[PDB]
Design a protein around this ligand. Structure first.
Ligand SMILES: [Mg+2]
Length: 283
C-alpha cells in the first residue's frame, strides 16, 4: 500500500485567508491502528496543529461542528493553514505519525501556495506527456518538445499543474518520471501533480477535480488559463472548469496537437514558436 502525500495546493484569498485542496496522506508502514500526526513545513515544526488517523490509514483534521461533534476534515481551516507560514510556490511538508507500538513514522511531500490571481496551466500526463494512454521501468516515451514548451510557459508567469488518473500506487512513480524527463537540455517545470479522487478511495472525476481546484480561487477570477489533454473528455473537463475553448490543446498518438478553438492542427514545437501569442507574459 501507498506511503506518501499527494501534492497539496493552497490559495491565498484577497481577504488574506487561505483555502486548500484536500489533504491526502497515507502511512504505509502503520498497520495496527487500534496515533497523533504532527507537521513540519520547510523544516520547522508547526505548533498547535495535528491530524488523526482512521483505521484504513487516511489522516484528517479534527474539527468541531455546531453540535459539538468531531468532524473529520480533509481540508484544514484557514487559521490552521496560516500557522504553516507557507512561502509562495513550493514548500516542503513532513507528516510525523507517533504510535506507541510502531514508534515515529515520517512521510514527506510537497505543498504549493498560490495567490488568488495566479494563472494555472493544466496538463494531463498519460498520452499528453507520455506518448501512449502495472509493470513499468520509467522508460515511457515522451512526446517531443513538451519540456521546452512547458518551460517557456512557466517562464511567462503561468504555473504548470499536472493531472494523473493512475492508481495511487503509481503516484510516486509519476513524480519521478516527470522530474527525470530531459529533452535537449530542457526539463519539465516543477509543479503539483493532482490525482483524480476516484483513485483515493476512503470514507466525471477529472471534471470534478478541476472544479474543486477552480473553487479554491475566488469566483470573480478565472484561474485555469489553459489545458493540455489527449482525449475529448479532457476538453469537456477543462471547459466546465472555466478554460476557454481557444486554450484547450488536444494531442494524438502521432503528436499532432489540435487547438480546439481555432480548429488548428499544430505540435508542441509550433505552439512553442507562438508562445508569446498563446501564453502571453504575465506582469
Ligand atoms: Mg490522457
Amino acid at each position: 500500500s501507498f506511503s506518501g502525500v499527494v501534492d497539496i495546493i493552497v490559495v491565498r484569498q484577497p481577504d488574506d485567508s487561505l483555502k486548500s485542496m484536500p489533504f491526502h496522506i497515507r502511512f504505509g508502514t502503520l498497520k495496527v491502528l487500534d496515533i497523533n500526526i504532527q507537521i513540519t513545513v520547510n523544516d520547522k515544526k508547526i505548533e498547535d496543529v495535528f491530524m488523526l488517523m482512521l483505521p484504513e490509514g487516511a489522516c484528517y483534521f479534527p474539527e468541531l461542528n455546531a453540535k459539538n461533534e468531531i468532524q473529520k476534515k480533509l481540508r484544514p481551516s484557514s487559521a490552521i493553514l496560516k500557522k504553516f507560514n507557507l512561502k509562495n510556490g513550493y514548500n516542503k511538508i513532513q507528516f510525523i505519525a507517533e504510535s506507541d507500538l510502531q514508534g515515529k513514522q515520517l512521510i514527506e511531500g510537497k505543498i504549493y501556495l498560490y495567490n488568488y490571481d495566479t494563472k494555472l496551466v493544466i496538463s494531463d500526463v498519460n498520452g499528453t506527456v507520455t506518448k501512449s494512454d502495472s509493470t513499468i521501468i520509467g522508460k515511457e516515451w515522451t512526446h517531443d518538445d513538451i519540456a521546452e514548451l512547458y518551460t517557456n510557459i512557466q517562464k511567462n508567469g503561468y504555473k504548470m499543474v499536472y493531472l494523473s488518473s493512475r492508481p495511487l500506487y503509481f503516484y510516486n512513480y509519476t513524480q519521478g518520471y516527470l522530474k527525470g524527463i530531459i529533452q535537449n537540455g530542457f526539463t519539465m517545470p516543477d509543479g503539483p501533480i493532482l490525482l483524480s479522487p476516484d483513485q483515493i478511495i476512503s470514507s466525471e472525476f477529472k471534471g470534478a477535480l478541476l472544479k474543486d481546484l477552480r473553487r479554491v480561487f475566488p469566483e470573480e477570477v478565472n484561474p485555469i488559463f489553459a489545458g493540455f489533454g489527449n482525449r475529448d473528455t479532457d476538453a469537456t473537463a477543462c471547459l466546465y472548469a472555466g478554460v476557454i475553448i481557444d486554450n484547450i490543446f488536444i494531442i494524438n498518438e502521432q503528436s499532432q496537437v489540435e487547438i480546439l478553438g481555432k480548429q488548428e492542427k499544430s505540435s508542441y514545437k509550433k505552439i512553442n514558436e507562438k508562445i508569446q501569442e498563446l501564453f502571453p507574459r504575465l506582469p
